[PDB]
Design a protein around this motif. Structure first.
Motif, PDB file in Angstrom:
ATOM      1  N   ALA A  12      32.830  39.264  29.512  1.00  0.00           N
ATOM      2  CA  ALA A  12      34.026  38.443  29.358  1.00  0.00           C
ATOM      3  C   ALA A  12      34.942  39.008  28.280  1.00  0.00           C
ATOM      4  O   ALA A  12      36.171  38.954  28.411  1.00  0.00           O
ATOM      5  N   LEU A  13      34.364  39.562  27.211  1.00  0.00           N
ATOM      6  CA  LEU A  13      35.185  40.141  26.155  1.00  0.00           C
ATOM      7  C   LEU A  13      35.807  41.462  26.587  1.00  0.00           C
ATOM      8  O   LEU A  13      36.924  41.783  26.168  1.00  0.00           O
TER       9      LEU A  13
ATOM     10  N   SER D   1      38.642  30.708  38.963  1.00  0.00           N
ATOM     11  CA  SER D   1      39.546  31.808  38.649  1.00  0.00           C
ATOM     12  C   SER D   1      38.923  32.776  37.649  1.00  0.00           C
ATOM     13  O   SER D   1      38.847  33.979  37.902  1.00  0.00           O
ATOM     14  N   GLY D   2      38.474  32.238  36.513  1.00  0.00           N
ATOM     15  CA  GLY D   2      37.970  33.093  35.449  1.00  0.00           C
ATOM     16  C   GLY D   2      36.714  33.846  35.843  1.00  0.00           C
ATOM     17  O   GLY D   2      36.594  35.050  35.599  1.00  0.00           O
ATOM     18  N   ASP D   3      35.757  33.145  36.457  1.00  0.00           N
ATOM     19  CA  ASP D   3      34.512  33.794  36.853  1.00  0.00           C
ATOM     20  C   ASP D   3      34.754  34.843  37.933  1.00  0.00           C
ATOM     21  O   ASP D   3      34.148  35.920  37.905  1.00  0.00           O
ATOM     22  N   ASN D   4      35.644  34.552  38.885  1.00  0.00           N
ATOM     23  CA  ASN D   4      35.955  35.526  39.925  1.00  0.00           C
ATOM     24  C   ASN D   4      36.724  36.714  39.365  1.00  0.00           C
ATOM     25  O   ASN D   4      36.551  37.843  39.839  1.00  0.00           O
ATOM     26  N   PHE D   5      37.573  36.484  38.361  1.00  0.00           N
ATOM     27  CA  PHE D   5      38.293  37.589  37.742  1.00  0.00           C
ATOM     28  C   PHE D   5      37.353  38.513  36.979  1.00  0.00           C
ATOM     29  O   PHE D   5      37.609  39.719  36.897  1.00  0.00           O
ATOM     30  N   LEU D   6      36.267  37.973  36.419  1.00  0.00           N
ATOM     31  CA  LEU D   6      35.323  38.806  35.681  1.00  0.00           C
ATOM     32  C   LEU D   6      34.615  39.789  36.603  1.00  0.00           C
ATOM     33  O   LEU D   6      34.625  41.002  36.359  1.00  0.00           O
ATOM     34  N   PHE D  33      34.667  43.824  45.227  1.00  0.00           N
ATOM     35  CA  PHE D  33      35.869  43.508  44.462  1.00  0.00           C
ATOM     36  C   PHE D  33      36.798  42.591  45.247  1.00  0.00           C
ATOM     37  O   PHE D  33      37.278  41.579  44.724  1.00  0.00           O
ATOM     38  N   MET D  34      37.071  42.938  46.506  1.00  0.00           N
ATOM     39  CA  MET D  34      37.973  42.126  47.313  1.00  0.00           C
ATOM     40  C   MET D  34      37.391  40.748  47.595  1.00  0.00           C
ATOM     41  O   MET D  34      38.140  39.771  47.702  1.00  0.00           O
ATOM     42  N   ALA D  35      36.066  40.645  47.716  1.00  0.00           N
ATOM     43  CA  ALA D  35      35.450  39.339  47.921  1.00  0.00           C
ATOM     44  C   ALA D  35      35.614  38.445  46.700  1.00  0.00           C
ATOM     45  O   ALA D  35      35.678  37.217  46.836  1.00  0.00           O
ATOM     46  N   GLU D  36      35.687  39.034  45.506  1.00  0.00           N
ATOM     47  CA  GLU D  36      35.860  38.263  44.281  1.00  0.00           C
ATOM     48  C   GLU D  36      37.329  38.039  43.941  1.00  0.00           C
ATOM     49  O   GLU D  36      37.697  36.951  43.484  1.00  0.00           O
ATOM     50  N   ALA D  37      38.178  39.049  44.151  1.00  0.00           N
ATOM     51  CA  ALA D  37      39.605  38.888  43.897  1.00  0.00           C
ATOM     52  C   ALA D  37      40.246  37.890  44.850  1.00  0.00           C
ATOM     53  O   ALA D  37      41.303  37.334  44.532  1.00  0.00           O
ATOM     54  N   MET D  38      39.626  37.648  46.003  1.00  0.00           N
ATOM     55  CA  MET D  38      40.123  36.703  46.991  1.00  0.00           C
ATOM     56  C   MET D  38      39.880  35.250  46.587  1.00  0.00           C
ATOM     57  O   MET D  38      40.267  34.345  47.333  1.00  0.00           O
ATOM     58  N   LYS D  39      39.253  35.002  45.430  1.00  0.00           N
ATOM     59  CA  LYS D  39      38.958  33.649  44.965  1.00  0.00           C
ATOM     60  C   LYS D  39      39.592  33.358  43.611  1.00  0.00           C
ATOM     61  O   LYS D  39      39.194  32.404  42.936  1.00  0.00           O
ATOM     62  N   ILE D  40      40.567  34.164  43.200  1.00  0.00           N
ATOM     63  CA  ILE D  40      41.135  34.033  41.862  1.00  0.00           C
ATOM     64  C   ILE D  40      42.154  32.901  41.815  1.00  0.00           C
ATOM     65  O   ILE D  40      42.025  31.959  41.025  1.00  0.00           O
ATOM     66  N   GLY D  41      43.180  32.975  42.659  1.00  0.00           N
ATOM     67  CA  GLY D  41      44.201  31.951  42.690  1.00  0.00           C
ATOM     68  C   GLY D  41      45.270  32.067  41.627  1.00  0.00           C
ATOM     69  O   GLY D  41      46.150  31.199  41.561  1.00  0.00           O
ATOM     70  N   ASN D  42      45.226  33.100  40.795  1.00  0.00           N
ATOM     71  CA  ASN D  42      46.243  33.345  39.783  1.00  0.00           C
ATOM     72  C   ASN D  42      47.126  34.510  40.210  1.00  0.00           C
ATOM     73  O   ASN D  42      46.646  35.471  40.816  1.00  0.00           O
ATOM     74  N   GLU D  44      49.135  36.445  38.060  1.00  0.00           N
ATOM     75  CA  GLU D  44      49.182  37.542  37.099  1.00  0.00           C
ATOM     76  C   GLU D  44      47.915  38.389  37.152  1.00  0.00           C
ATOM     77  O   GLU D  44      47.980  39.618  37.030  1.00  0.00           O
ATOM     78  N   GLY D  45      46.756  37.756  37.340  1.00  0.00           N
ATOM     79  CA  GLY D  45      45.516  38.512  37.411  1.00  0.00           C
ATOM     80  C   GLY D  45      45.385  39.304  38.697  1.00  0.00           C
ATOM     81  O   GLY D  45      44.852  40.418  38.698  1.00  0.00           O
ATOM     82  N   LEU D  46      45.860  38.740  39.811  1.00  0.00           N
ATOM     83  CA  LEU D  46      45.873  39.487  41.064  1.00  0.00           C
ATOM     84  C   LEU D  46      46.739  40.734  40.948  1.00  0.00           C
ATOM     85  O   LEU D  46      46.359  41.812  41.421  1.00  0.00           O
ATOM     86  N   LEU D  47      47.908  40.607  40.317  1.00  0.00           N
ATOM     87  CA  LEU D  47      48.761  41.771  40.110  1.00  0.00           C
ATOM     88  C   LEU D  47      48.159  42.729  39.091  1.00  0.00           C
ATOM     89  O   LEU D  47      48.363  43.945  39.190  1.00  0.00           O
ATOM     90  N   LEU D  48      47.417  42.208  38.112  1.00  0.00           N
ATOM     91  CA  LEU D  48      46.760  43.080  37.144  1.00  0.00           C
ATOM     92  C   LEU D  48      45.669  43.911  37.809  1.00  0.00           C
ATOM     93  O   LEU D  48      45.566  45.118  37.564  1.00  0.00           O
ATOM     94  N   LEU D  49      44.849  43.284  38.656  1.00  0.00           N
ATOM     95  CA  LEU D  49      43.793  44.022  39.341  1.00  0.00           C
ATOM     96  C   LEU D  49      44.366  44.958  40.396  1.00  0.00           C
ATOM     97  O   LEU D  49      43.854  46.066  40.591  1.00  0.00           O
TER      98      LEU D  49
END
Lengths: 83, 83, 83, 82, 82, 83, 83, 82, 82, 82, 82, 83
Positions: A12-13, D1-6, D33-42, D44-49
């Motif tokens: 996470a960090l 969002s957070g757990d899927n982004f990790l 990666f795509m299976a996890e990025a598909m559950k983010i819902g944000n 800015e993070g989708l564009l970051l990844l």
């Protein structure tokens, strides 16, 4: 030991480090993820290592988030003392 | 948002309330559990409600973890201001 | 073909590389986490990638743990050869 | 969002550390990666990844390179739809 | 260990609100409470739950009261073994 | 201390003992399962017991997996000695 | 797992009783958490116990939800009769 | 990984029953569908779900149809990479 | 019901294989066995495990032997309550 | 939550395919449907399922029809409350 | 795959230790065994478990004995389909 | 009473019905998924409904899987008979 919680808290960090300072909502979400995993760690050195790494990310976050980063690191240090 | 996390966190405070002030180890573990559940609550009111209930528990906890309780409550309040 | 086990194992080596050499206790715990995930990988190139990346971390761990790092990487190669 | 982004972010770091020849494992990490990025819902993070995913296109096999490009395009489309 | 103490403590509060005639539901909450209390590695938590369990003997069915008594004696024996 | 991982790991050796010496892929899969559960055992006797039981099954495993069984048991011992 | 569902449903009502009448969002989320667990209960006495306890919480809930609490206790009664 | 094929199939059936105006609900099911379809290793399943996803393009909102189009081509390239 | 009998039965087999000196490991397996045996709603299974657990009493540590006997007596009381 | 809409939608599809005589299974699928429909935070999803649930009432048993009805009314009040 | 073979093998071990009178538990362990044996995918594991299942036919009730023979027959047919 | 397993088993037959008779590897996988769920149903009406449905799929599956489809339907009818 709760080494899996240390692994998820460390990851996470790492993702919190690579986020831009403008993504306040994603930063705040990762700290909630980090704290939830760090609060399950029973190792004193693990809590302190994550506390010093969290403090290192404080320049990389929004100022509103930096206060959370500080209070979160203070909790991990206090949690290490109480163990 | 995350009401199941609010349920587990509220139950953590109720079990913590029934603990004697000398059971420092068990009180400390419920606090670790409470903060782990409260970290997943996205509702501002729920965090503040649990924070106030945690502060009311400060006199019933061991004196060596009362600072941790105080900082855990401030941790939740600052979370509600950030969401 | 796991894939997710490769992610947790790779993340375990990254957290292992960031630890100080004096934290043999977290090092031992992360190795146990890494081996638990690396053992569920059915990809030969992945097992060899983690084994090589694990061998590179031998100088950065405590000498008591280094023999565990040697046997862990040596077993990943034997597992890769058995696939 | 957070757990899927990790896990999605961790999928990109492991994908970056793979050699350009381990194509079967490179493909599997993008599926993770795509299976996890598909559950983010944000947004800015989708564009970051998606931006990080594009940076790994040179480090990837030529066959996987079109998958990487198409995957980053969809994360952009997913971000616009949100 | 703390999460097991939570569900075990919650099962006792639920068992406390049950009427003495709900014998089927009392037996099931004790099976639930014991299943959680058996994973508690804390001596103080077991002795507390065992004492709380014995306070519930007058409020449970007489057929269950023996199960209540044997379960409390188990928690003490588990506590002493730790 | 997680006896649940010891139960799965002990159950893996019992099923491994009942396999014919020719079932190479079945043996290899049970050993990947056994090790993944054995690495999460934090008890010295459990690791040494399973390592002793694993070496007793090496005459029953395929020749290709015999070296892997050999190093897997050595890993569990080197573990328990570092625990 | 009929008894485990009754535990989480009963815990949902106790947390609902401790909420202020203005926390309609939290009261709503707890109702959905309560019903999700109550639907998984196959005991007639358990459903009628929770339905009458839920009726007792109707004056203590936000007015927008008092209708939803009424139909929820109605549903649990119809379930117990159908069982 | 037919377990993921079941949920991805069920996602398309729920997507087919939604009104064209349920843009947000359509977007969530496609996010669920791609999360499940990304775990599929069978080639015929990725192509069958991709041809079924394309058949739903007239039934989704006009925003999302492009996302549906790219999600289908995503499954085509995955089946090709297998 | 059956999956809890499988784990409980598997716990006794692992407990019977433990030496009499492994006190901490014996205690954890009984904590595991009882946690699983406490969700078995089958009278024949509880009595089977109770008899099978009583036979393991000479194999375990003296302090665990008391826990073993209290455990068998609980399963018999559970079997009689069902 | 999209995953809960998917499981709830699948519950209605199986419920609609049941014969009018399968009272016990119709009752169990409703408990399954509601347990998933409760965790849906979308108005269009709740009203879509409540609309489909009302279309199944003529085909279910008279005792089940009263539960189908009150479950549709629950989801409508639920969407109003969100 | 290996974990499914483990639980299936453990299901036959607990099934063998059951008396011929515990039919509801013998039936439940067979449904537990088949539930795990269906997700094995190894031709040798299916035939080995089908053989061990057949050897338990003399120790089970005549009613379950027909379930044992059909379950072993299907595992044999499943092993050929692989 | 596990109606969830009936939902997953019913959805398995729907996806199996939509497959062409040529994707033998995928049809066989859904039979394994369907059987694993249908074993834990426990309802006599549900087992016969899925068995009758599964019989209607036998002409549509590959010729090799048809013998497995037939015996799979005979098992569910024997399960419901033993219930």
């Amino acid at each position: 030991m709760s080494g899996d919680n240390f692994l998820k808290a460390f990851a996470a960090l790492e993702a919190l480090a690579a986020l831009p300072a403008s993504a306040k909502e994603l930063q705040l979400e990762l700290i909630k993820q980090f704290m939830a995993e760090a609060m399950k760690i029973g190792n004193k050195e693990g809590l302190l290592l994550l506390a010093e790494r969290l403090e290192a990310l404080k320049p990389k976050v929004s100022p509103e988030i930096a206060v959370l980063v500080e209070k979160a690191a203070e909790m991990l240090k206090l949690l290490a003392k109480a163990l």
